[PDB]
Amino acid sequence: TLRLNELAPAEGAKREHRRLGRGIGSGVGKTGGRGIKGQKSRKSGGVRPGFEGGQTAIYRRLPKFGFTSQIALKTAEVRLSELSKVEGDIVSLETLKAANVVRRDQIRARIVLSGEITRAFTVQGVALTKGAKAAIEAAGGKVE
């Protein structure tokens, strides 16, 4: 035990890799699992993803819809349970960013009722849902 020639990996951790075209006995000899002839048996034989043989594809017989919002990329969602990562009792955008629950380029945040908290927090300038606000006050905290 504890020698360079008495160390082994756990059972099932390692496997031999598959080696094609090395005889009848291996079970993957000759064609190597590619079948007989056709396009897929050639080198680089697959067709492009989304190609269906020539008929109009699924992503082209359906219409485009919607537009992309720019402020949604800067809006951040915060679970209520994540408030425990904040050091101190003040919950603001700056302290959430310091605790790393909000990305540094976000300009506003929202707190949703997802988990549970015990400490009392003071919330400054962060939007709260109805249930999140109720939980914040029930934990002995307040908003501004």
Binding site: P49, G50, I58, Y59, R60, R61, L62, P63, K64
Partner: protein, 63 residues
């Protein structure tokens, strides 16, 4: 390198909690001859079929 999204499919599909949603065809034009029931039932989103979900996943690896 990084897998690249097929932007045409990205413009057609969006992800739901357990799948993908999409709009319905045959509502762009030639609408006068269509019955009211077809007009109001082809409106809105539906789900992508399970037979097409795999292709959608290969085409849109990040959504």
């Amino acid at each position: 390198a990084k897998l690249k999204t097929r932007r045409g499919a990205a413009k057609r599909f969006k992800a739901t909690a357990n799948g993908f949603k999409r709009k319905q065809a045959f509502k762009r034009h030639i609408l006068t001859k269509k019955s009211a029931k077809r007009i109001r039932q082809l409106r809105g989103c539906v789900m992508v079929h399970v037979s097409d979900v795999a292709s959608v996943r290969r085409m849109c690896p990040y959504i």
